[PDB]
Amino acid sequence: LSNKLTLDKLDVKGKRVVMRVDFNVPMKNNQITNNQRIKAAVPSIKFCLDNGAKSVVLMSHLGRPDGVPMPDKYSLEPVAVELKSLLGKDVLFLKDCVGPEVEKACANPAAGSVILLENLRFHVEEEGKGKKAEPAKIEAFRASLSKLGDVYVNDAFGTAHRAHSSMVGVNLPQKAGGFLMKKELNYFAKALESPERPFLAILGGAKVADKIQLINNMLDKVNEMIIGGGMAFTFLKVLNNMEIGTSLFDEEGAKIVKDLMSKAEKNGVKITLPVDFVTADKFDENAKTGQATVASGIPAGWMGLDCGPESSKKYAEAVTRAKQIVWNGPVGVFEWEAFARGTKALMDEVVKATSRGCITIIGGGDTATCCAKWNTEDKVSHVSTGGGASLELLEGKVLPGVDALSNI
Ligand SMILES: Nc1ncnc2c1ncn2[C@@H]1O[C@H](COP(=O)(O)OP(=O)(O)OP(=O)(O)O)[C@@H](O)[C@H]1O
Ligand SMILES: O=C(OP(=O)(O)O)[C@H](O)COP(=O)(O)O
Ligand SMILES: [Mg+2]
């Protein structure tokens, strides 16, 4: 951020601040399971208010509603309630993010107003595709967001990899990175400069279509990679002709698996895949469960929702060899206890590693919730609010949300 405008150099006195944040917080039974991402934005929000901002208008997405309004499942309303306790100020929650009446509400608010807009992704123009969007409308969407502030701050580190309207398309003459964006980028700048070696990446989770496309570049930076969670099944099917049942599978990524493995071998990156699994007869917390190995396959209609004990042992071995680890993506559906064991065991290994001097970086909306859940946040080196975003830094990329900031 050395030659970008940052919030500490932005005169906010008397100005309306429109601020992109990543409030894409994990949810369960309609409740926030982890407020980490919300707390992370507080220092930027408090700075603005203490320095005389007229208002702070917060905007974020939540989940992947893909351009349809879905307040029943994906409203940011519960975040507004949560933001209130963290700030010690009230926050006006609006039921849309654009335009006429949202614009009226943000036009000239009372001094010190904090306002939270509804889920950006209820409009197709944020991404702007979903379930296919028109440029003229994309332009209008962006103009509307731009009206909501006099100056713009992006503190959405967790979303910085996304060139979406709210992240790269706000037209104000001052576009500054917030304090969370700064802290996260500075930390990674340091950690990624000359990583300790062996440098292990651990990649799991459920965003297979996306994160499988990050491995190619990551293979030029790391010495080992665990590929677990939902990611593993695409690899195992292509390499070992493993039956995977209805486990997560990416058709596109399946096509590049052999290329990735060739590059890994060429670059001397040891790939550790799982060898066994906890299976489930359906995608439900209370599914009937089973056990499978790669050799046995996962039966018809069942899905692998955790790795098994032999996989945990292989994972622990890779972690024992590491002097630096970057972990994004739980290695099972850890939100459900029947499938939490693999992620819990890896966490124990990562904490042990930290205690003997391994530099351990855990990132992502869901992966950082693993830390909250098992109370390891102070027991690893760094818990980042970015998952995908952190993996794109490891790739060596400039993040679109940082790139779109004003130059000093
Ligand atoms: N084997 C699996 N099958 C299905 N889902 C899985 C499996 N393993 C893990 N998951 C799911 O992975 C999801 C997380 O994937 P995701 O990429 O969103 O991770 P994340 O930590 O939030 O990263 P990000 O910060 O970039 O969003 C979790 O909800 C978990 O339930
Ligand atoms: O949670 C997010 O990334 P993460 O699951 O990789 O941590 C970001 O909020 C962006 O969400 P997205 O992957 O739906 O664009
Ligand atoms: Mg996630």
Domain boundaries along the sequence of the chain: 2-180, 187-395
Q: Which residues make Cβ contacts (< 8 Å) with residue 203, sequence separation at least 6? A: 211, 214, 215, 218, 225, 226, 227, 228, 229, 231, 328, 329, 391
Q: Which ligand is nearest to the CA of 206?
A: 1
Q: Which residues pair with 16 in a beta bridge?
A: 55
Burial of 62 (0-12, 13-18, 19+ CB in 10 A): buried
Q: Which residues make Cβ contacts (< 8 Å) with residue 5, sequence separation at least 6? A: 174, 175, 176, 177, 405, 406, 407, 408
Q: What is the resolution of this structure in A?
A: 2.1
Pocket test for ligand 1, best of 249, 333, 383 (most atoms within 8 A of CB): 333
Residues 195-213: b if buried by 16+ CB within 10 A, e if exposed: beebbbbbbbbebbeebbe
Q: Which residues pair with 27 in a beta bridge?
A: 32
Q: How far is CA 45 from CA 172, 261, 387, in A?
A: 19, 45, 22
Q: What does the alpha-carbon distance between residue 261 and residue 257 come to, in Å, rounded to a whole number? A: 6
The reply to whether CATH 2.60.40.4070 applies to domain 2-180 is: no
Residue nearest to atom 10 of ligand 2 (CA): 159
Q: Which residue has the tokens 């930290």?
A: 354
Question: Which residue among the candidates 15, 37, 237, 314 is catalytic per the annotation?
Answer: 37
Q: What does the alpha-carbon distance between residue 267 and residue 375 come to, in Å, rounded to a whole number? A: 36
**331 — phi, psi (to 5°)?**
-90, 5
Query: Is 210 labeled as ligand-binding?
Result: yes
Structure tokens at 85: 């306790």
CB 395: neighbour CB atoms within 10 A?
Answer: 18
DSSP 8-state class, residue 328: E
**CB under 6 Å to ligand 2: residues?**
22, 24, 64, 158-159, 162, 207, 364-366, 387-388
Residue 16: active-site member: no
Query: Is 37 labeled as ligand-binding?
Result: yes
Q: Nearest CA to 224 among 332, 58, 131, 353?
A: 353
316: phi > 0 → left, psi -120 to 50 → alpha, else beta; which? alpha
Pocket test for ligand 2, best of 20, 21, 23, 24 (most atoms within 8 A of CB): 24
DSSP 8-state class, residue 33: S
Pocket test for ligand 1, best of 207, 285, 306 (most atoms within 8 A of CB): 207
Burial of 290 (0-12, 13-18, 19+ CB in 10 A): middle
Q: How far is CA 165 from CA 133, 169, 270, 385, 399, in A?
A: 12, 5, 39, 21, 14
Query: Is 123 labeled as ligand-binding?
Result: no
Q: What does the alpha-carbon distance between residue 34 and residue 371 come to, in Å, rounded to a whole number? A: 10
Q: What does the alpha-carbon distance between residue 247 and residue 339 come to, in Å, rounded to a whole number? A: 14
Q: Which residue has the tokens 């990416």?
A: 250
Residue 112: active-site member: no
Q: Which ligand is nearest to the CA of 167?
A: 2
Residue 37: active-site member: yes
Residue 207: active-site member: yes
Q: What does the alpha-carbon distance between residue 366 and residue 34 come to, in Å, rounded to a whole number? A: 9
C-beta of residue 389 within 8 angstroms of C-beta of residue 364 = no
CA dihedral 230, 279, 380, 207 (to 10 degrees): 20
Q: How far is CA 190 from CA 193, 373, 394, in A?
A: 5, 28, 12
Which numbered atom of ligand 2 lies nearest the CA of 61? Answer: 9
Structure tokens at 283: 């995608």
β pairing state of 113-116 and 175-177: unpaired
3-state DSSP assignment of residue 204: coil
How wide is the angle at C-alpha 168 spanned by C-alphas 132 and 221, nearest 5°?
Answer: 100
Query: Is 36 labeled as ligand-binding?
Result: yes
Where helices occur in 277-403 by DSSP H, the ranges are 309-321, 341-355, 367-373, 388-395, 400-403
CB 71: neighbour CB atoms within 10 A?
Answer: 13
Q: What does the alpha-carbon distance between residue 69 and residue 122 come to, in Å, rounded to a whole number? A: 4
C-beta of residue 159 within 8 angstroms of C-beta of residue 61 = yes
Query: Is 367 labeled as ligand-binding?
Result: yes
CA of 388 to the centre of ligand 2 (A): 6
Q: Is 253 in the pocket of ligand 1 (CB under 6 A)?
A: no
CATH class of 187-395: alpha beta
Q: How many residues does the chain have?
A: 408
